[PDB]
């Protein structure tokens, strides 16, 4: 069964305020989504040492940005600790819920939306780029799930039964028509090096086709 779940309030408040602001500057949603792999990966390898079965499930860390032009999409993949069904239905929005709040009171003091990752909810500036966003994800103590949401209120969550991941993320961003300059892959090299240069796990950056 897919299952269907409502954002809180606030969460889809932010997420109309992503799609409808106008705002040039884009390109920052790739840090905040590499940053967010980075953070998972230091969980894992941090977890690992007191105890080591915890890499069982894959010893590998590290982070792959995979294009695709053909499904228009642009995939954000890292073996880190990965997420729970709790985290994707409730613990992570309501951790987010503070932050929102945050970042709103912020932008109107004239913060600007290239800020959003220091108030912990910079996944949503995914929303700058993508029209519909889908996260692949298995957590050690887990199945492995989707959850997928286009905005307008509402998300779902199944267990995924596609390729098995071992351990990790993947953040499948179906671009808007207008944004698949970041696709190309001189745009992402330029992106990751001015952004993302001092990230401590190897980034892939995959070709086409
Ligand atoms: C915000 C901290 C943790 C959540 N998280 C994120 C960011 C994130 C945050 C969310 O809430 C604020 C969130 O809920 C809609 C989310 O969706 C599944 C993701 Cl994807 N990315 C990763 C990742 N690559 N690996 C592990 N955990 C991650």
Redesign the pocket.
């Known amino acids: 069964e897919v299952e269907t779940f409502a954002?809180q309030a606030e969460?889809a408040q932010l997420m109309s305020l992503i799609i409808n602001t106008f705002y040039s500057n884009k390109e920052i949603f790739l840090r905040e989504?590499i940053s967010?792999?980075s953070?998972?990966?230091d969980?894992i390898r941090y977890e690992s040492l007191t105890d080591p079965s915890k890499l069982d499930s894959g010893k590998e860390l590290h982070i792959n940005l995979i294009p695709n032009k053909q499904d228009r999409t642009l995939t954000?993949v890292?073996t880190?600790?990965?997420?729970t069904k709790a985290?994707?239905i409730n613990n992570?929005?309501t951790?987010?819920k503070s932050?929102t709040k945050a970042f709103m009171e912020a932008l109107q003091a004239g913060a600007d939306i290239s800020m959003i990752g220091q108030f912990?909810?910079?996944?949503?500036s995914?929303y700058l780029v993508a029209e519909k966003?889908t996260?692949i994800?298995k957590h050690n103590d887990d199945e492995q799930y989707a959850?997928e949401?286009s905005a307008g209120g509402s998300?779902t969550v199944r267990t995924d039964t596609g390729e098995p991941m071992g351990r990790?993320?993947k953040?499948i961003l179906h671009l808007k028509e207008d944004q698949t300059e970041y696709l190309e892959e001189r745009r992402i090299k330029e992106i990751v090096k001015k952004h993302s240069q001092f990230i401590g796990y190897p980034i892939t950056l995959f070709v086409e086709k």
Not at 80 to 83: Q, R, S, V
Not at 120 to 124: A, D, L, R, T
């Open positions: 954002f969460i989504l967010n792999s953070d998972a990966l969980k954000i890292d880190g600790i990965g997420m985290d994707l992570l929005g951790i987010a932050g912990g909810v910079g996944f949503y995914a966003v996260v994800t959850w949401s998300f990790g993320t953040v």
